[PDB]
Design an enzyme around this catalytic site. Structure first.
Site, PDB file in Angstrom:
ATOM      1  N   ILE D  13       1.894 -12.702  29.987  1.00  0.00           N
ATOM      2  CA  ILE D  13       0.772 -13.605  29.985  1.00  0.00           C
ATOM      3  C   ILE D  13       1.278 -15.094  29.377  1.00  0.00           C
ATOM      4  CG2 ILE D  13      -1.399 -14.583  29.130  1.00  0.00           C
ATOM      5  CD1 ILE D  13      -2.494 -11.669  28.896  1.00  0.00           C
ATOM      6  N   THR D  77      -1.517 -15.035  21.798  1.00  0.00           N
ATOM      7  CA  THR D  77      -1.453 -13.704  22.808  1.00  0.00           C
ATOM      8  C   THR D  77      -0.853 -12.703  21.999  1.00  0.00           C
ATOM      9  OG1 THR D  77       0.473 -14.439  23.782  1.00  0.00           O
ATOM     10  CG2 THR D  77      -1.656 -14.453  24.991  1.00  0.00           C
ATOM     11  N   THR D  81      -0.499  -3.616  20.534  1.00  0.00           N
ATOM     12  CA  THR D  81      -1.137  -2.954  21.467  1.00  0.00           C
ATOM     13  C   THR D  81      -0.891  -1.522  21.672  1.00  0.00           C
ATOM     14  OG1 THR D  81       0.384  -3.731  23.148  1.00  0.00           O
ATOM     15  CG2 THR D  81      -1.572  -4.986  22.779  1.00  0.00           C
ATOM     16  N   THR D 116      -5.778 -11.979  21.593  1.00  0.00           N
ATOM     17  CA  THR D 116      -5.497 -10.672  21.321  1.00  0.00           C
ATOM     18  C   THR D 116      -6.401 -10.007  21.079  1.00  0.00           C
ATOM     19  OG1 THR D 116      -3.852 -11.992  19.558  1.00  0.00           O
ATOM     20  CG2 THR D 116      -4.311  -9.744  19.113  1.00  0.00           C
ATOM     21  N   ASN D 117      -6.482  -8.482  21.667  1.00  0.00           N
ATOM     22  CA  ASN D 117      -7.789  -7.865  21.671  1.00  0.00           C
ATOM     23  C   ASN D 117      -7.861  -6.976  20.691  1.00  0.00           C
ATOM     24  OD1 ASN D 117      -9.120  -8.236  24.220  1.00  0.00           O
ATOM     25  ND2 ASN D 117      -7.021  -8.085  25.140  1.00  0.00           N
ATOM     26  N   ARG D 148     -13.063 -11.458  38.429  1.00  0.00           N
ATOM     27  CA  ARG D 148     -12.942 -10.254  38.993  1.00  0.00           C
ATOM     28  C   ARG D 148     -14.357  -9.869  39.802  1.00  0.00           C
ATOM     29  NH1 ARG D 148      -9.769  -8.349  34.082  1.00  0.00           N
ATOM     30  NH2 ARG D 148      -7.784  -8.573  34.839  1.00  0.00           N
ATOM     31  N   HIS D 172     -15.992  -9.365  25.367  1.00  0.00           N
ATOM     32  CA  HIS D 172     -14.948  -8.951  26.452  1.00  0.00           C
ATOM     33  C   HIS D 172     -14.634  -7.224  26.013  1.00  0.00           C
ATOM     34  CE1 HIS D 172     -11.822  -9.295  29.121  1.00  0.00           C
ATOM     35  NE2 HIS D 172     -10.732  -9.285  28.369  1.00  0.00           N
TER      36      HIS D 172
END
Ligand SMILES: Nc1nc2c(ncn2[C@H]2C[C@H](O)[C@@H](COP(=O)(O)O)O2)c(=O)[nH]1
Ligand SMILES: Nc1nc2c(ncn2[C@H]2C[C@H](O)[C@@H](COP(=O)(O)O)O2)c(=O)[nH]1
Ligand SMILES: Nc1nc2c(ncn2[C@H]2C[C@H](O)[C@@H](COP(=O)(O)O)O2)c(=O)[nH]1
Ligand SMILES: Nc1nc2c(ncn2[C@H]2C[C@H](O)[C@@H](COP(=O)(O)O)O2)c(=O)[nH]1
Ligand SMILES: Nc1nc2c(ncn2[C@H]2C[C@H](O)[C@@H](COP(=O)(O)O)O2)c(=O)[nH]1
Ligand SMILES: Nc1nc2c(ncn2[C@H]2C[C@H](O)[C@@H](COP(=O)(O)O)O2)c(=O)[nH]1
Ligand SMILES: Nc1ncnc2c1ncn2[C@H]1C[C@H](O)[C@@H](COP(=O)(O)O)O1
Ligand SMILES: Nc1ncnc2c1ncn2[C@H]1C[C@H](O)[C@@H](COP(=O)(O)O)O1
Ligand SMILES: Nc1ncnc2c1ncn2[C@H]1C[C@H](O)[C@@H](COP(=O)(O)O)O1
Ligand SMILES: Nc1ncnc2c1ncn2[C@H]1C[C@H](O)[C@@H](COP(=O)(O)O)O1
Ligand SMILES: Nc1ncnc2c1ncn2[C@H]1C[C@H](O)[C@@H](COP(=O)(O)O)O1
Ligand SMILES: Nc1ncnc2c1ncn2[C@H]1C[C@H](O)[C@@H](COP(=O)(O)O)O1
Ligand SMILES: Nc1ncnc2c1ncn2[C@H]1C[C@H](O)[C@@H](COP(=O)(O)O)O1
Ligand SMILES: Nc1ncnc2c1ncn2[C@H]1C[C@H](O)[C@@H](COP(=O)(O)O)O1
Ligand SMILES: Nc1ccn([C@H]2C[C@H](O)[C@@H](COP(=O)(O)O)O2)c(=O)n1
Ligand SMILES: Nc1ccn([C@H]2C[C@H](O)[C@@H](COP(=O)(O)O)O2)c(=O)n1
Ligand SMILES: Nc1ccn([C@H]2C[C@H](O)[C@@H](COP(=O)(O)O)O2)c(=O)n1
Ligand SMILES: Nc1ccn([C@H]2C[C@H](O)[C@@H](COP(=O)(O)O)O2)c(=O)n1
Ligand SMILES: Nc1ccn([C@H]2C[C@H](O)[C@@H](COP(=O)(O)O)O2)c(=O)n1
Ligand SMILES: Nc1ccn([C@H]2C[C@H](O)[C@@H](COP(=O)(O)O)O2)c(=O)n1
Ligand SMILES: Nc1ccn([C@H]2C[C@H](O)[C@@H](COP(=O)(O)O)O2)c(=O)n1
Ligand SMILES: Nc1ccn([C@H]2C[C@H](O)[C@@H](COP(=O)(O)O)O2)c(=O)n1
Ligand SMILES: Nc1ccn([C@H]2C[C@H](O)[C@@H](COP(=O)(O)O)O2)c(=O)n1
Ligand SMILES: Nc1ccn([C@H]2C[C@H](O)[C@@H](COP(=O)(O)O)O2)c(=O)n1
Ligand SMILES: O=c1ccn([C@H]2C[C@H](O)[C@@H](COP(=O)(O)O)O2)c(=O)[nH]1
Ligand SMILES: O=c1ccn([C@H]2C[C@H](O)[C@@H](COP(=O)(O)O)O2)c(=O)[nH]1
Lengths: 305, 306, 305, 306
Positions: D13, D77, D81, D116-117, D148, D172
């Site tokens: 990203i 970011t 993960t 960051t998720n 989207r 999100h």
């Protein structure tokens, strides 16, 4: 209605190419690759960026050479990059294959070849695709000079595009860096050396850095793809919008510089009908020697396919 | 927050300047003029185009010098252009005195681009009356003049206009110094194209004369130049606001270069975030240096009459 | 190769159109007019700006309708504005002259009419030029809504493009301002009224200001030219780049809103083939009544030619 | 002079972010990461594209948080993960503590965009450990999710993608609230197109599921998406840096709106030169408020596990 740009090869270079095509609203994109899910994944991700960019370019992925049908521009990045001369008979097939398809589906397309060594690869695909001399070129000078232009601009603290530089002969280690032809804002570089704003050692250092820029990046644990893709898109945009930019690319030599059936990098005018002029630089004796070595290495490798 | 660009003068050049500022989303615009409704009309019309341009630049009109306050860029097109021609210099001198007074009081840290002709005199007067530093005020000249020469050459060689590079120095106007030795095409010396018979020396000299007379060619056609002048100013102003460090030929204070002092003259400069960041002295040969001396000498003739 | 855009009328709107075309590198420009030398002067001036713009657009002036030959887009601003009802037979004869030439020289172009009253004139030039329904439209909605959008965005302090609004029926004093259809960042305007971030009185003030913006500016200056020109180029760019933007424009009605054999303003989609959709809004009875008043006034003026 | 944008995380990203920043000439770029040498390689590659892009941004790589110094924009970011996903939350928490620690000392005045998720948790954690004001830190979410939804609707109706407007709020991730009532096409309510039979409600709900699952659809064909996320972040960042005041759906601190407090959630906001200038509370109906409450509840679940 809207031009069809087919990326034959969907690696990191094709990825950035698709991104920049959407950013500039340049045309619909087919992301081709032989790997099976990668292009459709990239095309889907990239399609969504039409919203952020205010564009309407379709971006679809493919594993079928039949999607070249009706292409207006074909950009060939497909090919092996290891597992060194040993790769040339392999990449020779890939060009035979692609050329066969180009000949059947989009005989009328504008072809940009990137596969290295580009001055060999662009000629092989020239012969197997049968497209005219002025409709196929190879990426080289725009990329090499973009590095040389950038490194000088940082030493002189000016805008990178204001440095002009000419790199001819061939892409790769035998590239010809024409120190006599470098300007800064239209001013000969030699005036900045005389002014002690940059030294001849620094200029030759920058030349060596330029020649080795691909390997400098690879050693940093990355690979060049952003700058190559922007260089490819500059050539393609000059075609699609009839800009007639003067760009250095690999084209068919029919006598220029004393060479006659090989491809080599020379300044060109890319316009709506394709290569519209091939500009032969009036090189003096030292430069024609270094040019001849560049062409000689292209023919060394071409005799091994 | 967002830079404030004040156009002192809202004629056809100022109009296109505001339009292009909105297109490029460069900053808020004040369209100043001494005429009573013209700037307010132009600003209203122009503000609406934020929608089509996807921008958010406020565009308001004014007849008050007090709207210079907090300006980040000031662009001066105000001044007389007729009512034999030197007669206008004391008039426009008095206008620069007024503008300079306000600049000194309201936006002493602004970046000043002067357009009023003869620009090499006018930019110095406003330099002196406003007291802004040497590296924060320049005059339009080279970008406009060379834009014509580049364009006329690019059409003869059927290449992209920006791919032609050329330098015109000394002064904006009849004594502009056209440096044939410095013209390139795609980075290539022009002489190679003459050698190749792609263009002849006679054609190059016709193009030089066309360039020197381009303003009058357009006036004779019952129009006037403003689009190309405005585009040239916005290129110079954009290089400052976005710190691009473009090499642009403009009128700046000469403190020895080419053998001249306490006078303004056109020479390549680097426009960056801090203003003029370099003044680049071309290494002219004796004949080019002679024509440069004439351009400066003509600037000093006119400066002695204000 | 490169598109040919012929500006029939080289006044203050055509001036900005040629400028914006060069700025966006959209195509070669012919600035036509019946005043004799003025267009050659404007085009000469404008041509030089290619350099600052990094574009390559030819910009020439003309006093001969023969330069309509091969035009890809024709933009009609020419016509009388003085020396009211009495101008309509005159401007009719001009549309007859232009249509005759369009029919003979560039019958396959995309026509955008601006000459007022636009909904009458675009119909007259439609019938005399013989171009398909979908290759000719009149400026109106994009310009009118830009005023409405801008003024709302300034009260709510948001980006002007983030306000969306529809103005239909006809260009001019009977334009239909659809309060029910106003959104801000996709959110209904009513939510901002409820939040007291804007009042119904202020919205109605903005409505009157929009309806009277042309005359407000004429009183300070002259007829507006910057914003109409950006609106015409937005519509023209949507055609040339196949963007398929939804734009409110004056088009032939073949039943929608209960009206036929008349042109009126309604949202449509402009793409590479021209008008690709005519979108009939589902108006309630009161909006449908105000729409009828706009078309009714279009036909009263059309009976006076 | 020129803005300094520090990318904390130089993965796929960040790669597209650095590319798009040079394309738009937005500012100098620092590509930070804890993986070594890799960012300096990517930055070198990216620097050269200044030539093609006509811009002047310095692009350098770094493995040192000391390069946050003077950042005007920080985009986060970085984070784990892989190597159930609740197990990553205390790890990614401690990274936010590290980044927040340095932000507080080196660039306390930056505009922070967290990616960051799970973003609505991480953006709150980084909010509290850095001490930056509420209106100078937000999380990526709505701009990306709605891209989207917009794109797919526009492809069925054959219109320009940007001409579709839609709001996706709450959080999100899988509990995102897709507000069918708020969807317009060129400013026209979507329902008008359903009534006209140009798209069925049934196709709309297919598009809704596709939107919710787009990340996983792409992950199975490739990896996590990177082009659209980067373009979405750069849209938000440009709106900050150029004072556009765009209405964008992002994750911000809730102080009562929708009935929720001391939590971050996705809602339309206005991003201008000072950061978040407005937080827009949609007037949701009861069933929409039910779906919004579930999004916040899942954010609060995960936040309780740090
Ligand atoms: N472990 C392993 N499996 C592979 C590799 N290449 C392909 N496969 C598997 C994936 C599929 O299950 C199967 C057939 O693959 P093919 O590409 O259709 O083989 C490889 O390099 N390693
Ligand atoms: N006829 C004529 N009237 C003028 C002229 N200049 C100004 N006026 C009028 C306009 C007003 O009614 C009045 C005062 O104008 P002042 O610009 O405020 O004089 C001019 O040149 N000619
Ligand atoms: N030189 C000149 N220009 C005119 C004349 N009448 C109109 N114009 C200008 C104004 C506009 O720019 C353009 C078209 O005129 P129309 O009146 O819109 O020409 C005239 O008699 N002479
Ligand atoms: N050069 C010039 N232009 C004129 C003259 N009279 C009118 N015009 C301008 C304004 C008119 O609208 C335009 C065309 O006029 P023609 O009479 O159709 O030319 C004149 O005597 N000379
Ligand atoms: N060379 C190298 N790159 C790594 C390694 N782990 C991650 N990366 C890359 C992937 C991303 O581009 C970036 C950040 O890693 P993270 O796992 O997202 O660095 C590693 O062990 N070696
Ligand atoms: N070059 C290199 N990178 C490593 C190594 N181990 C891990 N990495 C990569 C992936 C890790 O996410 C990142 C930082 O690890 P560090 O242990 O915090 O670097 C190693 O031994 N060498
Ligand atoms: N299409 C693909 N191409 C390459 N590697 C793949 C792949 N799909 C899965 N893998 C890798 C990553 C997984 O951890 C590993 C084992 O997956 P199996 O489905 O268990 O294979
Ligand atoms: N994550 C990683 N990415 C790339 N190369 C790696 C890597 N981890 C290890 N390597 C290199 C180190 C060695 O040269 C080689 C094989 O290492 P094994 O641990 O034998 O791969
Ligand atoms: N502000 C202004 N500046 C210059 N001329 C003007 C003007 N307002 C009006 N005129 C001109 C055009 C009119 O035909 C003429 C007579 O107008 P009176 O208002 O009658 O004056
Ligand atoms: N509309 C117009 N625009 C510009 N000049 C004009 C004009 N009408 C006439 N002229 C010129 C012709 C003469 O050179 C001058 C004065 O003309 P009188 O009719 O004397 O102005
Ligand atoms: N036959 C024609 N074709 C195009 N434009 C015309 C025209 N006759 C007049 N015009 C334009 C020029 C002016 O703007 C206006 C008429 O003014 P003149 O004074 O005729 O309309
Ligand atoms: N500001 C002004 N107000 C009124 N008439 C003006 C004027 N400037 C010039 N005129 C004269 C010139 C011509 O004789 C006449 C033409 O008026 P219209 O363009 O028809 O008006
Ligand atoms: N302290 C830290 N700051 C920033 N990024 C970190 C970090 N620790 C780990 N990361 C990133 C690097 C990788 O993308 C991922 C962790 O993988 P490594 O194998 O530790 O998260
Ligand atoms: N396509 C693939 N599928 C599965 N394992 C793979 C793979 N390519 C490389 N590996 C190996 C290399 C390392 O030993 C290991 C690392 O997996 P993850 O990054 O944790 O997987
Ligand atoms: N995780 C990874 C990914 C790629 N690579 C290297 C080895 C692969 O042959 C090469 C692929 O390059 P790509 O194709 O441009 O990158 C790696 O060493 N580790
Ligand atoms: N297996 C390895 C090899 C090198 N390295 C480190 C050593 C240096 O810091 C850097 C250079 O590695 P490479 O070889 O270019 O990576 C590592 O961490 N693990
Ligand atoms: N996790 C790791 C470990 C090593 N490396 C790279 C760094 C070194 O340049 C290279 C050396 O590989 P090997 O050991 O010869 O591997 C990596 O990219 N990621
Ligand atoms: N996470 C990964 C895995 C592989 N790759 C591949 C893509 C290219 O073939 C190669 C080099 O990309 P890197 O970025 O310079 O590694 C990657 O870029 N990222
Ligand atoms: N209708 C008009 C308008 C202007 N002009 C000329 C004479 C004015 O002095 C001059 C104004 O130029 P502006 O200011 O750039 O233009 C004209 O002759 N006829
Ligand atoms: N008074 C005048 C003078 C010239 N003209 C015409 C003659 C030419 O066609 C053109 C040139 O005028 P000007 O002088 O450049 O205008 C006119 O119509 N009326
Ligand atoms: N209606 C008119 C009449 C003359 N003119 C122009 C043509 C001439 O070049 C200019 C000067 O005319 P005078 O006669 O010198 O006026 C015009 O533009 N419009
Ligand atoms: N209709 C009019 C009247 C005057 N003017 C003025 C503006 C300038 O001062 C001058 C020259 O503009 P023209 O466009 O080349 O005429 C105009 O441009 N248009
Ligand atoms: N001073 C002048 C010059 C030309 N004219 C006329 C001569 C022609 O009939 C008309 C067009 O001139 P232009 O040249 O096209 O203008 C005039 O009336 N007065
Ligand atoms: N082959 C190697 C070389 C260095 N290294 C180690 C040495 C240091 O502790 C670490 C960082 O190396 P680099 O050089 O920054 O990598 C390794 O693990 N293997
Ligand atoms: O006496 C005049 C009358 C009109 N004109 C202008 C205005 C007219 O539209 C054009 C051409 O008309 P003519 O060629 O019939 O010339 C002129 O120059 N002299
Ligand atoms: O043996 C090893 C283990 C990790 N590394 C890499 C991965 C680590 O995050 C970095 C720095 O960690 P170290 O300085 O504590 O180095 C290494 O170079 N050698």
């Amino acid at each position: 209605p809207k031009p069809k740009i087919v990326l034959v090869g969907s690696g990191m270079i094709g990825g950035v190419m698709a991104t920049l095509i959407v950013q500039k609203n340049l045309g619909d994109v087919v992301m081709f690759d032989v790997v099976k899910n990668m292009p459709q994944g990239k095309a889907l991700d990239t399609s969504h960026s039409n919203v952020m960019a205010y564009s309407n370019c379709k971006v679809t992925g493919s594993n079928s050479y039949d999607d070249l049908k009706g292409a207006d521009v074909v950009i060939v990045t497909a090919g092996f990059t290891k597992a060194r001369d040993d790769l040339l008979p392999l990449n020779n097939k890939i060009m035979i294959e692609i050329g066969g398809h180009i000949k059947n589906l989009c005989p009328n397309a504008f072809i940009i070849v990137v596969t290295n060594p580009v001055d060999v690869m662009v000629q092989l695909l020239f012969e197997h695709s049968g497209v005219p001399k002025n409709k196929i070129i190879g990426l080289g000078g725009v990329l090499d000079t973009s590095r040389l232009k950038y490194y000088i601009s940082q030493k002189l603290n000016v805008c990178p595009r204001d440095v002009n530089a000419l790199i001819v002969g061939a892409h790769g280690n035998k590239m010809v860096l024409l120190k006599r032809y470098i300007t800064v804002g239209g001013i000969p570089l030699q005036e900045f050396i005389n002014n002690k704003k940059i030294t001849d050692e620094e200029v030759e250092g920058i030349f060596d850095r330029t020649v080795n820029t691909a390997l400098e990046i690879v050693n940093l644990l990355a690979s060049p793809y952003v700058a190559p893709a922007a260089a490819i898109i500059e050539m393609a945009e000059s075609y699609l919008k009839d800009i007639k930019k003067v760009l250095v690319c690999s084209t068919l030599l029919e006598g220029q510089y004393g060479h006659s059936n090989i491809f080599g990098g020379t300044p060109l005018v890319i316009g709506g009908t394709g290569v519209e002029q091939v500009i032969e630089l009036q090189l003096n004796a030292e430069e024609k020697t270094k040019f001849d070595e560049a062409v000689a290495e292209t023919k060394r490798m071409k005799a091994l396919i």
